[PDB]
Scaffold this motif. Structure first.
Motif, PDB file in Angstrom:
ATOM      1  N   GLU A 132      -3.877   5.175  -2.360  1.00  0.00           N
ATOM      2  CA  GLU A 132      -4.565   4.193  -1.472  1.00  0.00           C
ATOM      3  C   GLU A 132      -6.065   4.115  -1.774  1.00  0.00           C
ATOM      4  N   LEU A 133      -6.748   5.250  -1.926  1.00  0.00           N
ATOM      5  CA  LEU A 133      -8.212   5.280  -2.190  1.00  0.00           C
ATOM      6  C   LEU A 133      -8.496   4.804  -3.615  1.00  0.00           C
ATOM      7  N   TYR A 134      -7.482   4.740  -4.479  1.00  0.00           N
ATOM      8  CA  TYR A 134      -7.617   4.160  -5.840  1.00  0.00           C
ATOM      9  C   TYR A 134      -7.420   2.639  -5.765  1.00  0.00           C
ATOM     10  N   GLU A 135      -6.283   2.186  -5.235  1.00  0.00           N
ATOM     11  CA  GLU A 135      -6.000   0.737  -5.031  1.00  0.00           C
ATOM     12  C   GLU A 135      -5.323   0.555  -3.675  1.00  0.00           C
ATOM     13  N   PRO A 136      -6.122   0.312  -2.613  1.00  0.00           N
ATOM     14  CA  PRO A 136      -5.584   0.087  -1.273  1.00  0.00           C
ATOM     15  C   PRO A 136      -4.535  -1.031  -1.267  1.00  0.00           C
ATOM     16  N   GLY A 194      -1.503  -0.511  -2.473  1.00  0.00           N
ATOM     17  CA  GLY A 194      -0.648  -0.194  -3.629  1.00  0.00           C
ATOM     18  C   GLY A 194      -1.177  -0.830  -4.901  1.00  0.00           C
ATOM     19  N   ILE A 195      -0.778  -0.268  -6.044  1.00  0.00           N
ATOM     20  CA  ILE A 195      -1.221  -0.666  -7.409  1.00  0.00           C
ATOM     21  C   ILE A 195      -0.551  -1.991  -7.782  1.00  0.00           C
ATOM     22  N   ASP A 196      -1.271  -3.097  -7.595  1.00  0.00           N
ATOM     23  CA  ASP A 196      -0.819  -4.445  -8.017  1.00  0.00           C
ATOM     24  C   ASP A 196      -0.552  -4.375  -9.517  1.00  0.00           C
ATOM     25  N   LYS A 204       4.015  -4.407  -6.267  1.00  0.00           N
ATOM     26  CA  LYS A 204       3.189  -3.222  -5.930  1.00  0.00           C
ATOM     27  C   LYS A 204       3.988  -1.961  -6.263  1.00  0.00           C
TER      28      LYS A 204
END
Ligand SMILES: N#CCc1ccc(OC[C@@H](O)Cn2cnc3ccc(Cl)cc3c2=O)cc1
Ligand SMILES: N#CCc1ccc(OC[C@@H](O)Cn2cnc3ccc(Cl)cc3c2=O)cc1
Lengths: 203, 203
Positions: free
Chosen positions: A163-167, A169-171, A74
Motif C-alpha cells: 500500500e505505501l508503495y502503490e496505494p 494495489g500495483i496497477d 491490480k
C-alpha cells in the motif's frame, strides 16, 4: 479457427463477455491458459500458432505480433499476517529484496524485467495457487492478482505489504499481443472494444 | 535543506500543492527540472545530492534510493494532422517504427526500455517544446504529456495516433525515487499522501 492465450493474472471472469463476442464472428475459438511468465515464450514458438494473447508481461517487439492495451488490473504484495515485514512500512517494503520471495518460474528459465524476482532468496512455482499455499505457510512473500488474494485477505489468512508503495494495489497493464493479420479486420476491432469495456467493469 | 527533481513530463501545476507541504516541514527546499531521459542519470551522480525525484522513468534498483508510485499521468502519440499515419488505424500504429520519431535525447546518450525511441528514423531534442515544434512542422511524430498537447489538439494543429493502442491516452506511472534516509520520517509520509492526493486531482 481462432486461438487465444490468457495468462493466470487475467480474471477468469474476463473471458465471459469476451468469448461471447469472438464466437459471434469466429466459428472455432480455442482458449489456452499459461503462467504470465510463459505467455510470450509460448506465442514465439511458430508451431504454437497463437492468434491473440492477453497477458500482463511486456516486451518491446515480438516478430510476428503487434501489441496494444486492453486495460488495467491490480496485484498486491502479500505475506503471512505475522510475517516479519507485516507492519508494511517503507523500510519493510525496501527489505523485500532480502526476505524469501515465492515467484512464478518459466519453461524458458528466463524472466522479463516486469516478472523477474526482486530478491536473492527465491522459490519458483508453476501457478499463483502453489505460490499462495507457501505464502499462507509463511515460507515467503509473493505478488499475486487481486482476484486470488481477495478471499484470503478478508479471511485474515494473508496481509498486504504494497500500500505505501502503490496505494490501491500495483496497477499493471493487460496487453493484447495479436498476429499482424488482424489489423484492418473489423472482427478484431469488434473484440478489442468489448474486451476493453469488459475489463473496465472488472475494475 | 531538501532538494527535489521533477522531470518535464510532470505537470508544472503538480508542484503547487506539493511544495506547500514540504515547506511546512522543511525550511530550505530546492526544485530542479530535467528531461525525463536525464532524471535518473542525475540522481546517480553523488555530488548531485538529490533527496527526492518525481519522474516517469523506471529502473529496478538505484544504489542509494528506494522507489514508490505517486500516481498516473497520460501521454499521447501525436503527429501533423495531415501526417501519413493521421488515420490512426492499427496498421498506422504498427508502422510508427518506420516513420521519423522526434525523441528526447539524454546527456548519458543511453535510454531506459520505457523512454528509448521505437523507430530507426530518430531525431533527438532536449525538451517537449522543441519536440512539438518539429511535430507541428510534420518533421516527424513524437509522444508527449497531455498538458503539452492539450492546447495544440483543440487548436487542430496536432492529431492523436495512440487511441486504438491505449484508449484515453497512454497511462504512465509517476514514480518517486527517495534517498533511503526518508523512510521512517513522518515529514516524507506527510509529503507522500498529499503528493498522491494532488496527482489524483490532476487526473
Ligand atoms: N511493495 C511493493 C512494490 C513491489 C512491486 C513488485 C515487486 O516485484 C514483483 C516481481 O517479482 C515481478 N512482478 C512485478 N510486477 C507484477 C505485477 C503483477 C503481477 Cl500479477 C505480477 C508481478 C510480478 O511478478 C516487488 C515490490
Ligand atoms: N500508438 C502507440 C503506442 C506507443 C507508445 C509508446 C511508444 O514509444 C515511445 C517511446 O519512444 C518512449 N516512450 C514511451 N512511453 C512514454 C510514456 C510517456 C511519456 Cl511522457 C514518454 C514516453 C516515451 O518517450 C510508441 C508507440
Amino acid at each position: 479457427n481462432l486461438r487465444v492465450l490468457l495468462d493466470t493474472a487475467i480474471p477468469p471472469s474476463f473471458c465471459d463477455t469476451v468469448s461471447s463476442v469472438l464466437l459471434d464472428d469466429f466459428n472455432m475459438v480455442s482458449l489456452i491458459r499459461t503462467s504470465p511468465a510463459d505467455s510470450l515464450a509460448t506465442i514465439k514458438q511458430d508451431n504454437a500458432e497463437i492468434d491473440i494473447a492477453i497477458t500482463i508481461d511486456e516486451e518491446l517487439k515480438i516478430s510476428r505480433f503487434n501489441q496494444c492495451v486492453l486495460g488495467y488490473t491490480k496485484a498486491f504484495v502479500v505475506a503471512h499476517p505475522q510475517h516479519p515485514l507485516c507492519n508494511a512500512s517503507l523500510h519493510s517494503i525496501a527489505s523485500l529484496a532480502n526476505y524469501r520471495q515465492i515467484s512464478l518460474g518459466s519453461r524458458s528459465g528466463q524472466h522479463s524485467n516486469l516478472l523477474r524476482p526482486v530478491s536473492d532468496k527465491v522459490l519458483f512455482v508453476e501457478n499463483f495457487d502453489d505460490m499462495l499455499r507457501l505464502v499462507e505457510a509463511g515460507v515467503g512473500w509473493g505478488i499475486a492478482p487481486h482476484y486470488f488474494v481477495e478471499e484470503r485477505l478478508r479471511n485474515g489468512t494473508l496481509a498486504v505489504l504494497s500500500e505505501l508503495y502503490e496505494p490501491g494495489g500495483i496497477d499493471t497493464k493487460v496487453y493484447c499481443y495479436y498476429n499482424t493479420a488482424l489489423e484492418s479486420e473489423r472482427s478484431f476491432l469488434r473484440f478489442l472494444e468489448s474486451a476493453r469495456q469488459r475489463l473496465r467493469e472488472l475494475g
